[PDB]
């Protein structure tokens, strides 16, 4: 093998099937672990009288002769952890009076003979974890009074009887975690003095064991993954030296008001899900706590003495309770993190966080805090994170928050004022309820959750001077030419054919669209470079609602009147219906009105952007409304197209030809202008392709009101009917 000068051989992994020969008799550590040895013959170690450490782990060992290990009076460590022994080699390990460590971990041991571990008068560590043991070997373990470490972890043990570990007086560590233990008698842990660690993690425990009372030296207790529901008072009466108590993942309802009490050395208390608890624990004597967590409970108050004692408290988590009032945190000089989210706290007083130095993280989200005192955070020391999201706030103080690195206020929709950026000089992250409140910080560089972008303009509403002049020209042309067309058409008020009526009504709808465009232009002019100060007010007030109603009404009324005009042209081409068409026009106007008013009864429609347009900017909100409007307009345009195609196909009407071509031009231009609006409305809801919001805003501002100015100029320039009507108006005025 790999013989070494220091008398420590390493035969591991050589594949041999016996004890190697030709080795020095002065060796003191032999490793024959990985090679496959299936048995140990008699006097297999007669050439190693000076062994002090024998490793046989990982062989396919299945039989050890009773005299195989005879003569190893100097053996101190024996490893057999990963072999195929089905039992404790009771006869083989006899006569090993100097053994101190014995490993039997992964052997499929199912039976422990009653005379096992006899003569092992120096044994101190025993491994029996990953076998298949159904009972604790009481009598075999009674032969090991010097044992100091013991593990029975992965066995199939279901219960522990009384006095199981009576003679284990020197035992220090006991592992029993991954057994299916469900029954612990009151005297099972009797005689277990000097025991410091007890592991009962993954057992099927039902109630809290009372056998712990006989463990005065216990320092660490683990029972976390059991099904324990109630921890009674005086549960740890007999364990004054406990430092760690693992109890998470137990389905817990009640913990008792004095379960944790007079535990001087306990450093962390974490309880979650204890719903039936409604009183803050009595922790007198437990003054060395550094972390306290009581998440899921019905606690309504915090004792004023929480900081008078618990001088070393660092982290406080009282989140998912229902706490109404906050006590004075005077004291708690070591407290760093406070988590009070998801409670029901309605106000923050001036002295709520009085003193309280070294407070770095403070969480107050999901509460009902409608009032924060101006100097509430004034006395705080170095504070980094502040979270007051979803708290129903109208004002936010700024004193003492210059050192913040992260602020969160996302859910306070009543907080409409603008945060001054001269206070949060060290700010690096921010969340605000509205995208216009992050204007004062722009882009050290701060990152703000609701992006300013292009559909929440910070300085100029319309944008560049090019778009501004385009929209101004569109507004003026639409207004003046629509007024001209309306006045000329309705000046005679004597003969009103269906085509004349439809032209006039389309002009009226275009005039309303021009009024909406003028609203936008005047708002952009008045808020020139300061639209941050106007955005919240405009989007939350009635102005955006009025503008959105005007825009939607104008567009839908134009579409419906155009469809009615196409139907009328088809009817006239095929072959006394003026009353019917008047009623149809009234119905179309009513439908446009109800479609425009529907977003008012809906919520979140007209506040998507300062353009007050519901569908173009928004894709995820109001998806049904956007889809319905887009599909309705597309179906109307398809009907117009098929009607025009049929009319052209079947018809070969000198007076009617002018109206036919005018309506064809109207439907052509309106459909051409509408299709990009629908495309851009559907664009942002698809993640495959990205389209710049700036181009979206510009194309919407240009094409949405474009028909309202293109139609009247077409009618004025290219209609002999308009020419003769203008002549009639001239005769009327003169």
């Amino acid at each position: 093998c790999s013989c070494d000068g220091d008398r420590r051989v390493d035969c591991s992994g050589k594949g041999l099937t016996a004890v190697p020969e030709g080795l020095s008799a002065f060796t003191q550590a032999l490793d024959i672990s990985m090679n496959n040895i299936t048995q140990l013959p008699e006097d297999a170690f007669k050439n190693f009288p000076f062994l002090e450490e024998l490793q046989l782990a990982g062989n396919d060992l299945s039989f050890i002769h009773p005299k195989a290990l005879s003569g190893l009076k100097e053996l101190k460590v024996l490893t057999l952890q990963n072999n195929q022994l089905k039992t404790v080699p009771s006869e083989a390990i006899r006569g090993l009076s100097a053994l101190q460590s014995l490993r039997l971990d992964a052997n499929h041991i199912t039976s422990v003979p009653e005379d096992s571990f006899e003569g092992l008068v120096q044994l101190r560590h025993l491994w029996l974890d990953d076998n298949s043991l159904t009972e604790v070997p009481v009598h075999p373990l009674s032969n090991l009074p010097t044992l100091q470490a013991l593990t029975l972890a992965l066995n199939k043990i279901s219960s522990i009887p009384d006095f199981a570990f009576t003679n284990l007086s020197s035992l220090v560590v006991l592992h029993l975690h991954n057994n299916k233990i469900r029954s612990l008698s009151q005297h099972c842990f009797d005689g277990l003095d000097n025991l410091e660690t007890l592991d009962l993690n993954y057992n099927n425990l039902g109630e809290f064991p009372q056998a712990i009372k006989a463990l005065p030296s216990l320092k660490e207790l683990g029972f976390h993954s059991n099904s324990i529901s109630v921890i009674p008072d005086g549960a740890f009466d007999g364990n004054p030296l406990l430092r760690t108590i693992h109890l998470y993942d137990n389905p817990l309802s009640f913990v008792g008001n004095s379960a944790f009490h007079n535990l001087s050395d306990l450093h962390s208390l974490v309880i979650r899900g204890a719903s039936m608890v409604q009183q803050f624990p009595n922790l007198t004597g437990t003054v060395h706590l550094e972390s306290l967590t009581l998440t899921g409970t019905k606690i309504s108050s915090i004792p004023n003495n929480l900081c008078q004692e618990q001088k070393m408290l660092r982290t406080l988590d009282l989140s998912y309770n229902n706490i109404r009032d906050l006590p004075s945190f005077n004291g708690c000089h070591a407290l760093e993190e406070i988590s009070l989210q998801r409670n029901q706290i309605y106000q923050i007083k001036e002295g709520t966080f009085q003193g309280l130095i070294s407070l770095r993280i403070l969480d107050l989200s999901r509460n009902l805090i409608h009032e924060i005192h101006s100097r509430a955070f004034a006395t705080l020391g170095p504070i980094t994170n502040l979270d007051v999201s979803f708290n129903e706030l109208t004002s936010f103080p700024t004193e003492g928050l210059n050192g913040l690195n992260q602020l969160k206020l996302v859910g306070n929709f009543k907080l409409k004022e603008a945060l001054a950026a001269k206070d949060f000089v060290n700010l690096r992250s921010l969340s605000v309820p509205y995208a216009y409140q992050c204007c004062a910080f722009w882009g050290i560089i701060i990152h703000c959750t609701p992006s300013t972008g292009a559909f929440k303009p910070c300085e100029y509403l319309l944008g560049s001077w090019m778009i501004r002049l385009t929209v101004w020209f569109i507004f003026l042309v639409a207004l003046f030419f629509n007024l001209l067309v309306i006045l000329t058409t309705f000046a005679s008020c004597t003969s009103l054919p269906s085509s004349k009526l439809f032209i006039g009504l389309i002009s009226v709808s275009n005039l309303f669209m021009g009024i909406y465009t003028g609203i936008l232009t005047f708002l952009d002019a008045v808020s020139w470079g300061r639209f941050a100060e106007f955005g919240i007010w405009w989007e939350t007030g009635s102005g955006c609602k009025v503008a959105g109603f005007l825009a939607v009404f104008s567009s839908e009324s134009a579409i419906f009147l155009l469809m009615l005009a196409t139907v009328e042209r088809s009817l006239s081409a095929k072959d006394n219906h003026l009353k019917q068409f008047r009623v149809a026009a009234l119905l179309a106007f009513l439908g446009a009105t109800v479609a425009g008013c529907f977003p008012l009864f809906h919520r979140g429609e007209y506040s998507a952007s300062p353009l007050c347009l519901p569908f173009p900017t928004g894709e995820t909100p109001s998806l049904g409304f956007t889809v319905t409007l887009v599909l309705l307009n597309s179906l109307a345009f398809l009907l117009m197209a098929v009607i025009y195609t049929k009319l052209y196909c079947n018809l070969e009407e000198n007076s009617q030809s002018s109206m036919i071509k005018h309506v064809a031009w109207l439907i052509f231009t309106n459909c051409i202008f509408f299709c990009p609006v629908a495309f851009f409305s559907f664009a942002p809801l698809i993640t495959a392709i990205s389209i710049s919001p700036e181009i979206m805003k510009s194309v919407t501002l240009i094409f949405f009101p474009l028909p309202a100015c293109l139609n009247p100029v077409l009618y004025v320039f290219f209609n002999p009917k308009f020419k003769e009507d203008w002549k009639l108006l001239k005769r009327r005025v003169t």
């Epitope: 009771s90 003979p113 009653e114």
Partner: nanobody, 108 residues
């Protein structure tokens, strides 16, 4: 139909918890028939009825009678003894203190 005979010519007295074991090449030694000093006998599941164990202290021998040797009965057979007391008798190889040489039993 074989008859295995085991002789104990060295132990002074008190033949306690004798038994028979069979082994396949490279596998564990599985008990087949164990006799207590009071005459109580414990057999394996695949052994009872077919085999029989008889300890005679007049000649101080141990007999294993084998009947209807199925083809999966070929192995190496050992006899084990335990002069000392203090354990419940059974088919566990770990409790016995003395072992025999063993004979190769093949179906024939």
């Amino acid at each position: 139909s074989l008859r295995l005979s085991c002789a104990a010519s060295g132990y002074t007295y008190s033949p306690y918890c004798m038994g028979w074991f069979r082994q396949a090449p490279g596998k564990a030694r599985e008990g087949v028939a164990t006799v207590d000093l009071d005459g109580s006998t414990i057999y394996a599941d695949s052994v009872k009825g077919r085999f029989t164990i008889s300890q005679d202290n007049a000649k101080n021998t141990l007999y294993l009678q084998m009947n209807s040797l199925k083809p999966e009965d070929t192995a190496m057979y050992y006899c084990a003894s335990r002069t000392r007391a203090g354990v419940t008798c059974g088919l566990n190889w770990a409790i016995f203190s003395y072992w025999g040489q063993g004979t190769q039993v093949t179906v024939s």
